[PDB]
Symmetry: C3
Subunit: 319 residues, 3 copies
């Protein structure tokens, strides 16, 4: 089996990273749609590591305004050890979320085995708010701030985040689909000189040129591991409505598939995160199934599923 | 103008697929006022009526291939009618009906113009052979019967003895592919057919897709163009009333852009409007939405431009 | 900043077209908190109020052209107000109202800045003359009254004697055309006006469309820009509450791109947000969808960028 199709499923039923309950059922509904079975139909080497058991911390006191610091920090700490275990076996770590605060552990654990990795962040938001710049206190919009090497000293010592060691630099992360960025978040994005492709850049260049520039920026000099942190709210709410923070004028169903198809084509996808799938925030049961079917289609395109077609290495006309 | 001289051919046929209602396609396309709207944009329109597809009851399946004699005779009858329309110097407009009728529509057009180029706008390749197919529906098998390179791979199917492969692998271009079977993808890649799947449409844009399509078919020499348009090629948000709808399709704008560029070459000689099923809609609005989009696609093929259209007269001095 | 100094003008007028409710356009735009959202965006906002349009009795139609004296007076009153806003060093923001008011908005803006360039975002050319029109609705006739090359082709219509042709055929660019009348297409091609119909938008992409639009109008040297935005220029799936909706229009993203690019030049001098009709929304959701889109379009004209916006201070320390 090919390295680009060898996967290691990791279930992350966590929700204390944001104030809306239901996102912890994300890995459950994705499995119910037959994600592991549809991947095996695509000639993929699939090995399940099950759902991580996240213990309850009732004595979790808020740091300044930051909500559930010990619960979020422990969840990512438990995920980091599991993601590193999947990478040691030589398998692509597939984290099923859950909120985007789990990206702290998923990227840290992946960096323990492959420290030369590049991050492609598909989201409507930067998720770069520091515990001092945050206005909501939700840690699902704070993962990148804890992971950046350039922000070493600007991040205060929040309880449960002691294990966190900055692994990625400002030049090793690329944003795709930005359309709802906070004033504090936009300042950090421009001061550190991080490469980004907001909806303005996607409309200007087209999804073809956006993917051509993204891959040439991270792989142009040398072939390095790729970590794709995919937030479903990165796509328009017409395709992914069952999510925590929906923002209009997002990436289309075709644009999302094109991003994921080009990432598979490089044969360097090493880490993958499917985050913010909330089956309870859906207005109708059709809106819930639509978000899950889109999230499944995004995942299958990461491991081989191409729109032009897929065939086994055999003669179909003369078998 | 020859690019606006049309010959309407009604093809009420549904035995190419298992879902009933697609035979009512020419009836509901006419009811939307297609012939009236074409005469409005200065087109010379001649209606040849609906083809009388006689009932073939004794039609046993070939292995798993459903209704072989009915599909074969319907295409053989359409081939004779399309050739008759082309002999009178008119653009053959085949109102479908299921896409299996393309066998006869392209074969009949090839009898008068053998040097023609095919533009296949569809979500599917329809290149399954009677042996590689899994459903046995002939509506997903037309391209296999027409390709010269697949000679020796098509078995003796009852009702298809008249079929002679007329188009080469280099004489066909696909646009809008997003649901291709493993057997179909093997044929598409081995024969080296030029294709623009939804991945290529997202990569280059509909502008470069059409620029490359016309340069690939009219590069060597200017030759007649046959446009086989399956309404499922467009997204189900514009054409929901169809048998096989697939998400992430061509937009209403992309569909108009393809058809507007094909008219501007002045080489469109054959056109198929297939898979319009007025009984496979969730609401009556979804049925009217598919037909209005199908009529808009057809009007753009014969002159209707979004920038505007005007007669060669002084509008400021009537 | 000069690019964020605005002068709000309310234009509750509907006699340019037959569908009632477009006069409630500035009312629902204000209810959505447009002025408040602009002030939060570090904009210097001055509200000149909603213009009172007195009902003219016995306004007989000129041939087939409906309500000529009402449309003419509404544009005459708007011309004086737009010029007053331009003299105070502010960007004129006209809240419509039907698109016939563009006669007054562009004329009044041209009285202070005669070297202005017009960017017309619309599904229609609105270039019909009082003789080529088949409906007689003046909302589809504003460009004909404004063009210098069409002087002598426009008859003496009552209420329009004050109109002086202020823009030339080379000074206007259309974006998003898909429903152009035969008479209108004849004028568009014979005058050699630059246009980017839905066909050109699909061909080049909104990125190349904006690059060519701004290079064609500003190429020689920096000059004022008048953006006349008709909400029907965008697809009816984003702006359904409108008088003349045409399928296959500009997306919500494309509309934000056009407006984000015009702000970046720092030369936006005049702005029209027209044809918002809250009575033409099938569901109250369709009404809010159109107004939310119209507000987003207006905010992008005065700084709101999708990549993010921040004050000139240190957010870390
Ligand atoms: O920091 C926060 O809590 C908020 N500031 C930007 C929008 C919102 C975060 C969006 C949710 B997520 O981080 O998952 O993209
Ligand atoms: O071979 C088949 O029966 C099937 N394979 C793909 C979808 C289906 C064929 C659909 C025919 B048409 O594209 O015209 O809708
Ligand atoms: O002249 C007319 O009455 C009509 N010809 C095209 C459509 C219609 C004008 C629409 C005016 B507007 O673009 O502002 O909605
Ligand atoms: Mn996120
Ligand atoms: Mn997000
Ligand atoms: Mn087909
Ligand atoms: Mn099809
Ligand atoms: Mn208008
Ligand atoms: Mn309009």
């Amino acid at each position: 089996s090919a390295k680009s199709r060898t996967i290691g499923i990791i279930g992350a039923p966590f929700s204390k990273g944001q104030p809306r309950g239901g996102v912890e059922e994300g890995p459950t509904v994705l499995r119910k749609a037959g994600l592991l079975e549809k991947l095996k139909e695509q000639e993929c080497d699939v090995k399940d590591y099950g759902d991580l058991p996240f213990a309850d911390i009732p004595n979790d006191s808020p740091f300044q305004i930051v909500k559930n610091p010990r619960s979020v920090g422990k969840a990512s700490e438990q995920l980091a050890g599991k993601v590193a275990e999947v990478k040691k076996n030589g398998r692509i770590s597939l984290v099923l979320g859950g909120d985007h605060s789990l990206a702290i552990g998923s990227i840290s654990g992946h960096a323990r085995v492959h420290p030369d990795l590049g991050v492609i962040w598909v989201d409507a938001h930067t998720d770069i708010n520091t515990p001092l710049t945050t206005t909501s206190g939700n840690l699902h919009g704070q993962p990148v701030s804890f992971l950046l090497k350039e922000l070493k000293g600007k991040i205060p010592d929040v309880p449960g985040f002691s294990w966190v060691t900055p692994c990625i630099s400002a030049k090793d992360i690329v944003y795709i689909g930005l359309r709802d960025v906070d004033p504090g978040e936009h300042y950090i994005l421009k001061t550190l000189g991080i490469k980004y492709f907001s909806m303005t850049e996607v409309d200007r260049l087209g999804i073809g040129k956006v993917m051509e520039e993204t891959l040439s920026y991270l792989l142009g000099r040398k072939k390095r591991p790729i970590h794709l942190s995919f937030d479903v709210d990165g796509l328009d709410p017409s395709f992914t409505p069952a999510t925590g923070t929906p923002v209009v004028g997002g990436l289309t169903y075709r644009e999302g598939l094109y991003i994921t198809e080009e990432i598979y084509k490089t044969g360097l996808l090493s880490g993958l995160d499917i985050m913010e799938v909330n089956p309870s925030l859906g207005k109708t049961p059709e809106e819930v199934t639509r978000t899950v079917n889109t999230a499944v289609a995004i995942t299958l395109a990461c491991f081989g599923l191409a729109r032009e077609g897929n065939h086994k290495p055999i003669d179909y006309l003369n078998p």
